[PDB]
Design a protein around this ligand. Structure first.
Ligand code: J7J
Ligand code: J7J
Lengths: 619, 619
């Protein structure tokens, strides 16, 4: 499992592992405690699996970002250094490892992007200077700049300069709704990049197999890259150097900062052994120096050893950039943002789209509710006794996208498209692929209660269920089985949710699923608000025959179901929608026109939270 | 002024004053302290004038309602009885004398409305019984009921029964916005009253000169009236009695409860002398009994003497009604409500309007922003060197209505209608008629600054003013004159409000007046929000040439000026108006249609807060 009185560390093969191994030796020497350092193939992939298991390493070495997910999962321990130790490192590095306002790793090294010696004797202080400068090198049958364009990481620092960002860092928390891809900053920066392409200075087709393949063959004078390039510009022996990034609009170009970190497994019994090894054997000028010798670690988190490294201009440069630039977010919403801005630039620079066009889309696509994309190739293992149709599996993919992105929703497919089976599919895939085995609540009408059991018994026999129904004395018989929580699903009706509330409200239901049935019935809000009062249900799903209704009362109750907390005190849609106009004590109901545009806006709002397919487009 | 070591009490001539005088004798007997009891003509009118002066009586005797205004003005002292004394009286009576959650009088007597002995041997338990019963007395060439209809006090108890009220009593405070004249309760009650008129049982023309003139001549069997009638039904010696009010829809008919009270002048030096006389000489079974002998006081607040009075069915009846019925509100908004419901009934019952029609209007007219009506016949005394035109004086009447009803507003009359003079008129009438002499703030543009001084110097020379302007060293010279507060008005410009804020924000400005000038300029909200941040100004007035603009930005800033507090955190109109739709993290600006109806609603909202007359309709 996870061996006591010893230390097993995972660090990638690209890093100076054999150097780290030596630091482990001095530990075992002065302490006797064995230290094993391994570089497992695709270790960052293997780590979460084995961590939930209670296996794996005691110490993990990867960038502070990938640690966010591990921290969300709780696979990393809250590191406890005293104040004095925190002063030994830069405060900005401790930020990179702070999750939910708790330190979850030890910051180690720092990497960023940075800016020839002969050809370019003096470097351009402002970005604005580069056209004049290019005319000179173009007159020499060459160019002044040729970095990677086709990728967004390299092209983002000027977009970031004037005030263009990804997620607005709140209190101690990023906001995935406050996205800065459409502000003047981003537009000034991206317009300028397209300015160089249209003025023939820079080519739009410019990728990495050119970014490096030209600056190394003496074709260009300047380039924007990181430490992984330095070693290949040494091979071609071109007289090079690195420096700070230019001030576009009298503002510094902000690149993304990667902080190599050491995290301790929440499963590892040797937590004080790891704090002792890290705080006293690794996070020391001597300890860091030891690793740096096998493969350099660029800038370091440690103030003391950083000054000694700042002797080299190259390291003092990346570190200067770092404090002025910005740290990579640990939040999963990054995959959307990068995909958004990747395409934004390709288009804007190719001519296919206007700067204001590409950035308009990129900003929307990244702030999108279904940001976390997750492919579902095949059904659950627990999902047997039949193979789902193409769309039913597609239905599960949107429902797991609902789960991953922590959103509630509606499956409004036409009756007889297998919504029942589709729910069953979500519940199984949420056990066989995620560790969500917790109490599922399923509210079905009497008339289909029995069919719901029937289909579970067929397709997912593994899923054990309580079927909350019967005489008062029969319902009582079930009372213990709940307290046990040996069940995955409970099935019951609208009647028992309200009547036997004093027993069913008591459970912390992981997922709540309501099946409206066949009957096209208009629902009142008074009831949903009452369900809301007593029931803890983070993830909600609604299954309905009917599509989105064009009636405010129904839409009002739909929102109270979909967003339970938000409308706590406010009981009516009238109170809610008059509110921006209510501040004069005037009490007037909405009119016909006012109402039409409210319904209009509500349909556009609920738009990404509903899924509906029709028999006529399927078969 | 207000003589020490003595007591002067005011009670009306209609009450048992010579009986109260005797209670004063026993005080002087056992204490030596002289007690003088006077019944001044229109004493409730004379009291506020003389109380603000620091003159008048030490003790005042009137109903708990008229004491609300005296309490708002602070002409009555916070009475301090210990817990034990409060138990001697009913808790519902102590409510009647609680203003701003402070006891401000001593409850004394209780009066209400109540319900023949022979003709009607058994009284009708339910209101619903009266048609069947009327058929009997109509078969005897008479009628079963003939009370006052033309008045609203008498007709309100059934309107009140099912749930029809005037002002929703909050925490310990009435809500003049939460008015219950349009609910099902009021409609069930008022429909029933019209049911009797259309079925020829009751006549719509029925007034007091019939309500009494018929029941006393043996014409009718039942009537709804109060204690002031009892004495005249004794003269005609008709075998009568009083009882509880019927249950319409299985609910008791709620009438209005008048609580005769004893208030102590906040000016009176003899505050402990009055508490001693009241708590120990008047509010005793023996003390109350003494007054009751000159002229009866119906039900009493005192538990102990009330049981002894409950021997008479008549008193135990009014007291039963009282606890089930409701107490008269002390708030000034009553004049609107009564005028609203007075006409509502006249119409509904005459046929001129439908129940749903009259009550629709009555509910609106009573919840109206300009509820407190106050006539202004002639201008101020301090307003000389010219006589105002008809509309300019009308302008002052709407501006004092703005003041009385504690509302901000706009005077958007066409340039050259004498808005300047009209402001001057409000400022003077607010000194000569109200004691508002406090610091007035007036913001005028540079170009008219000098004309503003000029017109004051002409019309209101009495009004002394600081004219905040000049070089830094000249502005400094004024610094003391402000700290003094020997001035009524300060005149200054937009420039000095922001620049010399660190000096002008420090004053608690009673009224703030902004004169937009002539220039049709579009105003930004960023500035009004900044003015709002640092300035204390309860009453605001805006003077402008231009009428209400059809642009959301301008309307947004207008609301921040008009309602300063309300939009504290919310900076934009976009954030504010998307808010009921914002709860999904979606950030989308309003469209063309959405915007049109917002402007629409805002114009209807601001409608009662703007005054505009045009040259073309005046001359
Ligand atoms: N489909 C559709 C399209 N468009 C519109 Cl506008 C409305 C639509 N339907 C809809 O909103 N359904 C809703 S809303 N609240 C509920 C609920 C509930 C509930 C569940 C269990 C117990 C209790 C208390 O007894 C209440 C339902 Br079910
Ligand atoms: N007339 C009219 C009709 N319709 C619409 Cl939509 C808008 C209209 N005008 C209007 O709203 N005026 C407003 S709004 N806020 C202000 C203000 C102010 C202010 C005063 C002193 C100092 C500072 C800070 O320097 C600011 C004014 Br003045």
């Amino acid at each position: 499992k996870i061996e006591e009185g010893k230390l097993v560390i995972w660090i990638n093969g690209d890093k100076g592992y054999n150097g780290l191994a030596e630091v482990g030796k001095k530990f075992e020497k002065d302490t006797g405690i064995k230290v094993t350092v391994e570089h497992p193939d695709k270790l960052e992939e293997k780590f979460p699996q084995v961590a939930a298991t209670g296996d794996g390493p005691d110490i993990i070495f990867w960038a502070h970002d990938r640690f966010g997910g591990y921290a969300q999962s709780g696979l990393l321990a809250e590191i406890t250094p005293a104040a004095a130790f925190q002063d030994k490192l830069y405060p900005f590095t401790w930020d990179a490892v702070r999750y939910n306002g708790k330190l979850i790793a030890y910051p180690i090294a720092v990497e960023a992007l940075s800016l020839n010696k002969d050809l370019l004797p003096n470097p351009p202080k402002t970005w604005e200077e580069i056209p004049a400068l290019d005319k000179e090198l173009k007159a020499k049958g060459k160019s002044a700049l040729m970095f990677n364009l086709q990728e967004p990481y390299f092209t983002w620092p000027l977009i970031a300069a004037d005030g263009g960002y990804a997620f607005k860092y709140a209190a101690g928390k990023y906001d995935i709704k406050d996205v800065g891809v459409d502000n003047a900053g981003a537009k000034a920066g991206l317009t300028f990049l397209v300015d160089l392409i249209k003025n023939k200075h820079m080519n739009a087709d410019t990728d990495y197999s050119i970014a490096e393949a030209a600056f190394n063959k003496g074709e260009t004078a300047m380039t924007i890259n990181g430490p992984w390039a330095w070693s290949n510009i040494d091979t071609s022996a071109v007289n090079y150097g690195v420096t700070v990034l230019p001030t576009f609009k009298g503002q510094p170009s902000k690149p993304f900062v990667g902080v190599l970190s050491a995290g301790i497994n929440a499963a590892s019994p040797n937590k004080e052994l790891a704090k002792e090894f890290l705080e006293n054997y690794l996070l020391t000028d001597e300890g860091l120096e030891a690793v740096n010798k096998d493969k350099p670690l660029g800038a370091v988190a440690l103030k003391s050893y950083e000054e000694e490294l700042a002797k080299d201009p190259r390291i003092a440069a990346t570190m200067e950039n770092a404090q002025k630039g910005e740290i990579m977010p640990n939040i999963p919403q990054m995959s959307a943002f990068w995909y958004a801005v990747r395409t934004a630039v390709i288009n804007a620079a190719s001519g296919r789209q206007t700067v204001d066009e590409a950035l308009k889309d990129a900003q929307t696509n990244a702030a999108a509710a279904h940001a976390i994309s997750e492919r579902v190739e095949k059904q659950s293992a627990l999902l047997i006794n039949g193979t789902l149709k193409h769309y039913q599996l597609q239905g599960l993919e949107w429902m797991v996208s609902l789960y991953n992105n922590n959103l509630n929703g509606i499956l409004a497919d036409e009756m007889g498209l297998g919504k029942t089976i589709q729910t069953i599919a979500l519940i199984t895939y949420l056990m066989e692929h995620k560790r969500l085995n917790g109490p599922y609540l399923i509210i079905v009408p009497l008339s289909t209660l029995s069919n719901w059991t029937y289909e579970f018994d067929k397709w997912a026999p593994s899923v054990v269920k309580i079927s909350y129904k019967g005489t008062p004395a029969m319902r009582r018989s079930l009372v213990p089985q709940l307290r046990s929580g040996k069940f995955n699903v409970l099935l019951t009706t609208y009647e028992y949710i309200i009547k036997d509330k004093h027993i069913l409200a008591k459970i912390r239901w992981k997922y709540m699923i309501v099946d409206e049935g066949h009957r096209m019935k208009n629902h009142h809000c008074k009831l949903t608000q009452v369900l809301n009062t007593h029931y803890v249900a983070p993830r909600r799903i609604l299954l309905t025959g009917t599509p989105l209704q064009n009636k405010l009362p129904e839409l009002w109750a739909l929102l109270n179901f979909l967003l339970p907390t938000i409308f706590k005190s406010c009981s009516t849609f009238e109170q809610w929608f008059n509110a921006p106009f209510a501040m004069t004590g005037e009490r007037v109901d909405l009119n016909e026109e006012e109402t039409i545009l409210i319904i209009r806006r509500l349909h556009k709002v609920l738009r990404p939270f509903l899924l509906r397919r029709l028999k006529k487009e399927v078969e």
